[PDB]
Amino acid sequence: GEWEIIDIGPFTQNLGKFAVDEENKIGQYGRLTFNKVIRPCMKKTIYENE
Amino acid sequence: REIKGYEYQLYVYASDKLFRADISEDYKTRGRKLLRFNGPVPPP
């Protein structure tokens, strides 16, 4: 829908941590230590139309 | 899960490797779900 870039503050660093922790329960890559979120970070917002 | 939420695409560094992660986020519940995780990728 809309699309926009967002800044890597502690909001984006959080979705970093969640993504790694969640992979580690399904850990096809072995197991991994998070390190950081780099730019760019994109964010789609969806509205009532599919 | 409803076209009423968000979707993020991310470049995460984990264990000195660069990965691609797409997350979803329900507007009402704040339900995040990890969607795709693939890597390593070349830096942007």
Curated annotation (Swiss-Prot), chain A:
Natural monellin has not been mass marketed to the food industry, primarily due to the challenge of large-scale purification of the protein which is relatively sensitive to heat or acid treatment. The keyword Iron does not apply. The keyword Hydrolase does not apply. Pfam families: Monellin (PF09200). The record marks C41 as: Blocking, abolishes the sweet taste. Keywords: Taste-modifying protein. Heterodimer of an A chain and a B chain. Taste-modifying protein; intensely sweet-tasting protein. This is Monellin chain B.
UniProtKB/Swiss-Prot annotation, chain B:
Coiled coil: none annotated. Pfam families: Monellin. It comes from the Eukaryota. This is Monellin chain A. Natural monellin has not been mass marketed to the food industry, primarily due to the challenge of large-scale purification of the protein which is relatively sensitive to heat or acid treatment. InterPro entries: Cystatin_sf, Monellin, Monellin_A, Monellin_A_sf. Taste-modifying protein; intensely sweet-tasting protein. Heterodimer of an A chain and a B chain. Disulfide bonds: none annotated. Keywords: Taste-modifying protein. SUPFAM superfamilies: Cystatin/monellin.
